[PDB]
Amino acid sequence: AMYIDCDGIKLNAYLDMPKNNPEKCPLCIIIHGFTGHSEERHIVAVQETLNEIGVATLRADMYGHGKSDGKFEDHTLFKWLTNILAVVDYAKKLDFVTDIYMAGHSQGGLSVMLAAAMERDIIKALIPLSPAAMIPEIARTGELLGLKFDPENIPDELDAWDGRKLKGNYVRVAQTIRVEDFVDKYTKPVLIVHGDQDEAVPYEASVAFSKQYKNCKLVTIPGDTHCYDHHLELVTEAVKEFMLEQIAK
């Protein structure tokens, strides 16, 4: 448990080492989704699985989320991207760190897709877990996570997601992002994981992205939901097999 500073916004994070406390291991940065945080069941499961195969984990609470600074309503993808650059720059100064990996769920899955492209030289492999990768396009077309609006007259505030508020700025920012450019720029190995009864983010976009990527493996979680209600073990298993593969090379 610590704080990484990002322009005065404290980002809360958890560095978990393998039990053996090795002097050298790789690091995976893990990013939760919209209204999420680093202690969610699926985040912890992935983190624990990694730790048992020798990968340190750095789970970071993004702007306005978890125990980080900022209000939820003020968060945007530019801020999240800025935070991720700050967490990478922090990881780069850790002595124990050999290679750096990225994983993340939903909005956090999208965010690591963006952020690995931007850090393409640095990030050895990428794990988007049910990435909300259509957020930008659907924003341009007038919806955000179930809520609709005129994409040319964005409201000042959107109220939804169980008592939360969100400034229209979120939408103004998301609309600018061309996700496909980021996908074309990251040619290193990608595992996308996705449940095919996902209610929140549609399975079929992940199929479309797995194919755009130069080197992407798509693992389907049969019958499963957005946060893997039914089969989280199938996700942890997927991540385990992929990463054993990657740390061997």
Added chain:
Amino acid sequence: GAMYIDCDGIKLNAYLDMPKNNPEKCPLCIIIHGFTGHSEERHIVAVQETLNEIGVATLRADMYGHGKSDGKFEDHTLFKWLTNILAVVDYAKKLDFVTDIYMAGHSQGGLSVMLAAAMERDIIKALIPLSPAAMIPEIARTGELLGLKFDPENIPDELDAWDGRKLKGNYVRVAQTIRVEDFVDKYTKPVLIVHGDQDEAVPYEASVAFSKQYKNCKLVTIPGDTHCYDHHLELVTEAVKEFMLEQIAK
């Protein structure tokens, strides 16, 4: 007045100057300086005073790592600047006297207003990029920023900038992502581009191309002039004047 606008704990220094008049209700132009610049530079002040003279309030703002605002120069990126601009807009929209909101900006601030205006396209009435540095994302993509050559695929941790300044490589990683042409396409209200045709820092011809891409843009060339209009600043202000009186008359 002078004031600080909070942007997530980063204080942004700004100047609100009224048309004096008052008046009771009037338009407001946001004015954004360029890379290593600030709100008290000659060319910025001059444009500011001209607007004030024809009835438009001005809100000049220092961006992250610049002028009197918080943060280090080497830590600024275009995403920080844009985020800063949306906080300035959010502040402006709360001012009771404000009728219409315009944007203007010089060089990197010219680029920033091209981007921000598209993002705020329902709010911003007209747009004035002054010698906009709108090639920055393209030359970041090619590894040719600041008289340097670097691999755009293996960006250095730190680049040397103007006059002993440093610039982190994050600046580049962020700039490579921005497709200026998308933002140009999305802003279909009146634009006035101004550019001097002996511009040392930012090639004139790029502004020709952008001016044709925009649905409604007038380009005013300043023949013989430099990046900061060392010779014919008069012409810039006169250009801004006539465009704006015309926009006020609509």
